[PDB]
Amino acid sequence: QSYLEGVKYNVDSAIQTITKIYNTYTLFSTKLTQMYSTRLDNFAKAKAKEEAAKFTKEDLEKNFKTLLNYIQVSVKTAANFVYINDTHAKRKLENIEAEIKTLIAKIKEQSNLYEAYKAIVTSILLMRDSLKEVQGII
C-alpha cells in the first residue's frame, strides 16, 4: 500500500502524460487537416503556414523523457512486490518501459513531425489502455 501511493500515482501521472500527447496530435493533425485542403485556398493556409508550424520535435521529444521517466520510476519503486498479483504486474510496468524505449527510437529516425506523430499514434493509445488494468488490482 505504501509502495502503491508511489506507484499508483506515477502510473496515473504517466497516463496523464499520454493523453497529453494524443490530444496535441488531435489539434496538430487538424492544423494540417486545414493546411492540406480543397476549401481553404489561402485564407487559413497562411494561418496554418505558421500555426501548424508551431509544433516542434523538441517539444514532443521532451514529452517522452517524461512518460518513460515516470514509467521507469514506478517499475523501480514497485520492485518490492513478491506475490502473484503484483509480480505479474511489475513486468507489465516493464514491457511498457520496453515499449517506450522502442517508441523513442522511432522518433529518432523520423524526419517529419507528422511522420513521427503517427508511428506512436497506434502505440500510445493501447499503451494507455494497458495501464487501465493496473487500477483494478490496486
Binding site: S29, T30, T33, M35, S37, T38, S111, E115, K118, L125
Partner: protein
C-alpha cells in the same frame, strides 16, 4: 463535417480513414479495395506515408485497430496536381495488402449504374472524421445533402468570380441555404445513395468554403469502367 449528427454503428460500414498527408476519408468496395480522392495522396501544395484505418466509427478504437498496409496505388491519369485549380479525375483506388473479413461493421459499398442516381431532388449522404462546425472530431458524422442543378453551380462559381473548372465528370451537391455541407477532413468520402442498395455515386472532390454553399463531388459513374478494370486482382 458541419451540421452533422453522430453516426451510429452499421450505418456507414464502408467508411475509411487516411492519415496519409493529412486527415481524410474513403470507401470500401469488394474487400481489398479502398476508394478515396486522388488529392488525399497528392495534395496541390518530406515523403509521405500511406495509413488506412477501418472498422470502427469512434476515432480512438479506429486507431487501436491497426493501420492496414498498402499493396497497390493507382490514381487516374486525368489528374494533375500541377494545376492549382483543377480537380478533374480526383479519383483513386487503393489495394489493401491483406483483405479484411466482412462483418456488419465492415461491409463494402456498391457502385451506381444509371445516370438517374444523378438527377435533381434526391438525398444522398457524406461521411467524414473531419472538422466540425467549431472544433475537431472523435466520431463519424453523417449528413443529408440533396444534389443540385449544375447550371446554377456555374452560376454560383461565376457569382463568386472563380476561374476554376466544373467538368461534367462532376455533379454538385448542396445549396447555399443548407446549413449542412461537406468540410475539410472529409475530402475522400462518398455521396452514398440508396436505390435498398447503397451505391457510391460521388467522390468528395473539392469546393469553396465549408458551410452554406455548393460542394463539388467527382461523379463516379463515368469512371466505373476504370474501377472494375483496376480491380483486376
Amino acid at each position: 463535417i458541419i451540421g452533422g449528427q453522430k453516426a451510429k454503428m452499421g450505418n456507414f460500414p464502408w467508411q475509411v480513414f487516411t492519415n496519409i498527408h493529412g486527415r481524410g476519408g474513403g470507401a470500401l468496395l469488394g474487400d481489398r479495395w479502398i476508394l478515396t480522392a486522388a488529392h488525399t495522396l497528392y495534395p496541390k501544395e518530406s515523403n509521405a506515408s500511406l495509413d488506412v484505418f477501418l472498422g470502427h466509427t469512434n476515432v480512438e478504437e479506429l486507431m487501436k485497430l491497426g493501420n492496414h498496409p498498402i499493396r497497390r496505388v493507382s490514381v487516374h491519369p486525368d489528374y494533375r496536381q500541377d494545376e492549382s485549380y483543377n480537380f478533374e479525375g480526383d479519383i483513386a483506388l487503393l489495394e489493401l495488402e491483406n483483405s479484411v473479413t466482412l462483418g456488419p461493421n465492415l461491409l463494402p459499398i456498391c457502385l451506381p449504374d444509371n445516370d438517374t442516381f444523378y438527377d435533381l431532388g434526391l438525398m444522398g449522404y457524406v461521411s467524414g472524421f473531419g472538422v466540425m462546425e467549431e472544433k475537431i472530431a472523435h466520431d463519424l458524422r453523417f449528413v443529408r445533402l440533396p444534389v443540385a442543378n449544375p447550371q446554377a453551380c456555374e452560376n454560383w462559381l461565376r457569382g463568386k468570380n472563380r476561374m476554376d473548372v466544373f467538368s461534367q465528370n462532376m455533379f454538385c451537391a448542396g445549396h447555399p441555404s443548407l446549413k449542412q455541407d461537406a468540410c475539410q477532413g472529409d475530402s475522400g468520402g462518398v455521396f452514398a445513395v440508396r436505390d435498398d442498395r447503397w451505391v457510391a455515386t460521388g467522390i468528395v472532390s473539392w469546393g469553396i468554403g465549408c458551410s452554406r454553399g455548393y460542394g463539388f463531388y467527382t461523379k463516379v459513374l463515368n469512371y466505373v469502367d476504370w474501377i472494375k478494370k483496376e480491380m483486376e486482382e
